[PDB]
Design a protein around this ligand. Sequence first.
Ligand SMILES: [Ca+2]
Lengths: 57, 577
Amino acid sequence: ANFLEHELSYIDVLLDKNADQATKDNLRSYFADKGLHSIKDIINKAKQDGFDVSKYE
Amino acid sequence: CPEQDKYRTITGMCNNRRSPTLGASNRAFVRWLPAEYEDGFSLPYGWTPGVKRNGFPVALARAVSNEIVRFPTDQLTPDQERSLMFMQWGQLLDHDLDFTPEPAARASFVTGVNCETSCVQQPPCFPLKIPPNDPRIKNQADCIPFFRSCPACPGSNITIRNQINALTSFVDASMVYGSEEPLARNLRNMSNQLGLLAVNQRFQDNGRALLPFDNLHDDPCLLTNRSARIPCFLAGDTRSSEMPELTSMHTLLLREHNRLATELKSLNPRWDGERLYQEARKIVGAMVQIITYRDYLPLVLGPTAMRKYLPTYRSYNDSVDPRIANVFTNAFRYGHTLIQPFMFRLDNRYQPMEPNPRVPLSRVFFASWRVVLEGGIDPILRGLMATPAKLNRQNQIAVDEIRERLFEQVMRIGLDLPALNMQRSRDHGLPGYNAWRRFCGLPQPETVGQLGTVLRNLKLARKLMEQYGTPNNIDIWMGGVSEPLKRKGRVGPLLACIIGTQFRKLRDGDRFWWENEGVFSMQQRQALAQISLPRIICDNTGITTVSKNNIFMSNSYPRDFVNCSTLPALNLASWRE
Ligand SMILES: [Ca+2]
């Protein structure tokens, strides 16, 4: 169920302006299959499950 | 589900095409003999007071442990012909094969008791009661906590209760990769097309990868060192953190995966992430089969049983059941007899390593922090190669670090793992000793004297009859480990049968067995024949001198060690298409 700490790096990649859009899209498909659809769903789950998300707007 | 696949599924589905659930995860254990419950359906023997098994009171598991398993631990007999790595491989292997879910303490809310804190015997709890005059638990209203393993068909007592294997029965390195699709992808590096497994992002081990951290609601690892706040690790199997020795072997294979995928990407640059992962996973899976069947199992069974129960491989046979038998979950716990009371850690030169070279196991359970903050996995892995295993002997069965102090640091009391073993075979409705003897074609003793003869130890036989009344009632783990060891093996005939039977079925009934036609090319199979555990250690650690083959026999430094130079590396050239 819970957000995993190494998945925080995935968030850094979705928020990397110069990161290959094909790579962001595989990460978004990965998160979609987990029920996390918008960037804010992803962050909010990370936060709900015990991680600091200041640094993400 | 297709009919020209080339890689295993994560769940084990579709290995047996005629019956695609055989060996798949989260299904009931096969039963090799019908279950034996107090009420014929689900109540474990011991559950109802005054209800005898075959005319005799049920012995408290803890009393059996106290009177039969307990011995002065400083008198332990080192095993001259096995390393501690022989113990650690059996634990890690077993975590490829079987895991039996139990319910969460938080399912206690509203309903039943918290099995962790109450001694009340109501579902789902089956607490171990305390005999009078126990050496440690002096309050007879106390108990050793115990959760009943989950029923595989929750419902209405009409069917006989059975239990669930949460893992792929196949020797497929599920301990590394997951037996479930969401876990398996959580274990993956999904931020690129390199085919890697995820690694820790806050820590490394002298530049080398550590397992990622798991996120548990009640993380036991954090409790072993309050200030360090190092949580448990994330792996294919939920127990990777139980002991840093085990963590070390999980971390070894994690790196071997990524090293393999790295080579395979240099060799075939057009392969995408999925294909890199699957191909490395395939190699890593055969390495586990090879180490297991070539190096480890001959030294469990010894030559005679190795030939009887594991003849030369022919080919795949889709009519054999590859499932894990319920009894194996308990019989393969023979290895608790090999366990030393200390975690041993050694340096560059195989000398005792500071801070703490000799740590009681009861300060090592779930101590994730010692891997991260006390030197990584090299000192642990040297300790495993250059320390003897404990020898199982009929009056030195198991050490008190696991019998008095199991998980002491993360529970309200130390548990007793042998006692847990016997309570667990009762939970699982396993038949007694003589019924497994019969199943194995072995004489069944009925009298103290006849038990004496089978064990070649009249005194152990008297103690066993004192506790149990009849050899029919002896719990399978207890009787199995009480037997004299076969020549050049570490089990008696009973456990040799059970264990060897199980592994034959896992090999002969595995469509992806590494020697079966079509799985690997002829050349790939001649390359894989070279692999060894010492070489895997050489490729993924700072260790340049390792144990010589057979690593599970080698155990004294410097006598049984060689430089890594000596050892052929794995040649992946055959993968170049
Ligand atoms: Ca498996």
